[PDB]
Amino acid sequence: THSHGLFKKLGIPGPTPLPFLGNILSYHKGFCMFDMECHKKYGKVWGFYDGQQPVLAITDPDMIKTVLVKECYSVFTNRRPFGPVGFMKSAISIAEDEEWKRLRSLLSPTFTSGKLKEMVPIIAQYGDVLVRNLRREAETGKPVTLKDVFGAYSMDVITSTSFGVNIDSLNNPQDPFVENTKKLPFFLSITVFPFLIPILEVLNICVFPREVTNFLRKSVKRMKESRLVDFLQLMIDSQNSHKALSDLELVAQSIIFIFAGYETTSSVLSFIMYELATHPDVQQKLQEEIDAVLPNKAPPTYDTVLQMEYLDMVVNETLRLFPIAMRLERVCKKDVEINGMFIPKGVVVMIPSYALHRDPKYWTEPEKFLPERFSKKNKDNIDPYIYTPFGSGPRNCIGMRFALMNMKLALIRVLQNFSFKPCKETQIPLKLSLGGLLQPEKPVVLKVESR
Ligand code: HEM
Ligand SMILES: CC(C)(C)OC(=O)N[C@@H](CS[C@@H](Cc1ccccc1)C(=O)NCCc1cccnc1)Cc1ccccc1
C-alpha cells in the first residue's frame, strides 16, 4: 500500500480509488452493471482496485486469447485466491500451478464424450421423477417455483452421477443425503481485509460449514470401502506419471462437482424456462423439433440430443444473456508484455463475460432473446473470445459437455409433456440479483399446463 498509483503510472484509465476500499463502493449495483459502465466509460482496457488489489480488465479478442490460452501454463495459471478454505485447497477449481496441472490430468478422462455417453441412462431415469413431481403441480392449477423443482432434479442427477445415490429429494424424504447437501456479507469483508485470510486459515473456519465436509469425508470412505459407472467410481478407478489421487483429495473434488452441477444446472434451466415462457413461439418451435426427432415422446438418447440444433441455439443464446460466472479471472504471475501492453506482476487480469455477452458493438439488440444468433448460418460469425460461457484454454469448464448434456436432457423430456405460461406473479422483465451471484432478484414462477 498504497498500490493505488499503479494504473495511473502505467497510463491505464480507471475510476479513482478511495483509500482502503479502492472502487468496491462501486459494487452496489452488482458486478455486472459496474463492468458495462467501465466498458462504455473507458474502452478496451481499464483498471481498478478491489481494496488494495489492482485489477486490469481486458476486452481485445487477441489479448484474451493471449491470456486464457497462449500464455496460460506460463503466466496466467491460477485464479484469484479466496479463503479460508482449509482442506479444499486441493480441489481443482482452487488448486494452483502444478498441483492444479496434476489434478486436471487425473480428472480429464472422466469428462470424455465416451464416459458421458454411459452416463446417459442414469441421467434419463430422474427426468421421469421430474415430470411426475411436475404433473402433481400441473393438475393442481397452482403456479410453480422453478428453482425448487429444477433443483430437486439437478440434485437428483448429481447424487446419482457422482455417488450412485438414488433419491427423489423433492418429496422422498429426509433421506440421509438430501440434507448435508442442503448447506449446499462474509465474502465482501474478505476484499477490504484479505490480510485476514491466513488468520482464518490457522483458525480452521471453513467457508464450507466445517460439518458438511466431515459428513462427506466420512460418507466417501463408507462408499469407498463398500464397493472395495459414476464420478466417484471414475475417480477411485483413477487412483488404482502423477502421484495417485488421495482419499481427501477425492472427497474435495466430489464437493467441487456438487457445487458445479447444482446451483448452476438448476439456475440455467430456470433462466431457460423464463425465456421460453416470455417467448411462446420459440417454445413451440422447439417442441416441434423435439417431436419430429422423438415422435410419440420417444425417450432421448445421447445421439438424438446432439441432433437438436434449435435446442442448442436456445441453450447458447440463454447462456449469452446469463453467463453464470459473469467474469473470468487469472492471476498474472510474472512481469509480462502481451499484444503490446505491459502488465506487472501480481495484477489480477479480469475478463468481463457479462458485459461482452451484452455488448452492442458485437451484438445487435443485445438485450433481446434471439436464438437465431446461433443458427448454423450465423454461428460462424461469433468471435469465440467474446462468447465464453465455459471459459477458454486449458482451464475452462471441465464439466462443459456434461452440463450441456445434463440440461438438454431435462428440457427435452419436459417440453415433450408441458407448455409454460406466464402467471400474473411472474416478474417481467426479470431483474438480476443486485448481489454477487447470477440469479434472478425474485424467484421465477410460472403456469404449467399438460399437453
Ligand atoms: C451450465 C453450467 C456451467 C457453466 C456455464 C460453467 C462455466 C464455467 C466457467 C466459466 C468456469 C471457469 C472457466 C474459466 O475460468 O476459463 C468453469 C470452471 C469449472 N467448471 Fe464449470 N460451468 C458449468 C457447470 C459445471 C459442471 C456441471 C461441472 C461438473 C462437475 C463443472 C466443473 C467445473 C470445474 C472443475 C471448473 C474449474 C476448472 C479448473 O480450474 O480446472 N462446471 N465453469
Ligand atoms: C478463488 C480461487 C481462484 C482459489 O478459486 C475459484 O475462484 N474458484 C471458484 C470460487 S467459487 C466455488 C463455489 C464453491 C463453494 C464452496 C466451496 C468451493 C467452491 C467453485 O469452485 N465452483 C466450481 C464449480 C463450478 C461452478 C460454476 C461453474 N463451473 C464450476 C469460482 C469459480 C468456479 C468455477 C467457475 C467460475 C468461478
Residue nearest to atom 35 of ligand 2 (CA): 325
Residue of minimum CA distance from atom 11 in ligand 2: 93
Tell me: is residue 423 an annotated ligand-binding position.
Answer: no
Ligand 1 nearest-atom number relative to CA 103? 41
Q: Indicate which CATH number applies to the domain containing 102.
A: 1.10.630.10
Q: Report residue 47 as a C-alpha cell.
A: 483498471
- Kindly compute the dihedral angle of the four CA atoms of residues 35, 40, 45, 48, in this order, to the nearest 10 degrees: -50
Q: At what resolution in Å was this solved?
A: 2.8
The bound ligand whose nearest atom lies closest to the alpha carbon of 92 is 1
DSSP letter, residue 70: I
Select from 93, 183, 191, 439 the residue to mutate for testing ligand 2; criterion: most ligand atoms less than 8 Å from CB: 93
Q: Report the relative pairing of strands 53-58 and 45-50 from DSSP bridges.
A: antiparallel
Residues 145, 269: Cα–Cα separation, whole Å? 12
Q: Which three cell numbers stand for residue 340?
A: 503490446
CB 99 within 8 A of CB 90: yes
> Cα 355 to chain center, whole Å?
16
Q: How far apart are CA 187 and CA 51, in angstroms?
A: 13
- Ligand 2 mean position, distance from CA 213 (Å): 16
Query: What ligand is nearest to the CA atom of residue 84?
Result: 2
Q: For residue 118, give the C-alpha cell.
A: 454411459
In the chain, the number of structural domains is 1
Distance 76 CA to ligand 1 centre (A): 17
Nearest CA to ligand 1 atom 27: 261
- State the method: X-ray
Q: Provide the angle, in degrees to the nearest 10, between the axes of the packed helices 247-263 and 210-227.
A: 110
Cell of 44: 478496451
Distance CA 425, CA 437 (A): 23
What is the CA(331)–ligand 2 centre distance, in A?
A: 15
Q: Which residue has a Cα nearest atom 30 of ligand 2?
A: 260
Domain containing 98 equals 1-451
- In angstroms, the Cα distances linking 199 to 20, 209, 346, 440 are 19, 17, 21, 34
CA separation, residue 137 to residues 103, 132, 211 (Å): 43, 9, 35
H-run or E-run covering 156: helix 146-163
What's at 140, amino acid-wise?
T
- CB-based burial, 250-276: b 16+ in 10 Å, e otherwise: bbbbbbbbbebbbbbbbbbbbbbbbbb
The set of protein residues with a Cβ atom below 6 angstroms from ligand 1 is 92-93, 104, 256-257, 260-261, 264-265, 268, 319, 324-325, 328, 389-392, 395-399, 402-403
Distance 400 CA to ligand 1 centre (A): 7
State the distance from the centre of ligand 1 to the C-alpha of 228, rounded, in angstroms.
Answer: 30
Distance 304 CA to ligand 2 centre (A): 31
Secondary structure class of 307 (helix, strand, coil): coil
Give the ligand at the shortest distance from the Cα of 271. 1
Residues whose beta carbon lies within 6 Å of some atom of ligand 2: 79-82, 88, 93-94, 208, 256, 259-260, 264, 324-325, 397
326: alpha, beta or left? (left if phi > 0; alpha if psi -120 to 50): left
Element (H, E) at 270: helix 265-278
In the reported structure, the alpha carbon of residue 398 is separated from the centroid of ligand 1 by a whole-number distance in angstroms of 6
Strand (E) or helix (H) holding 50: strand 45-50
Residues forming a β-bridge with 331: 78, 348
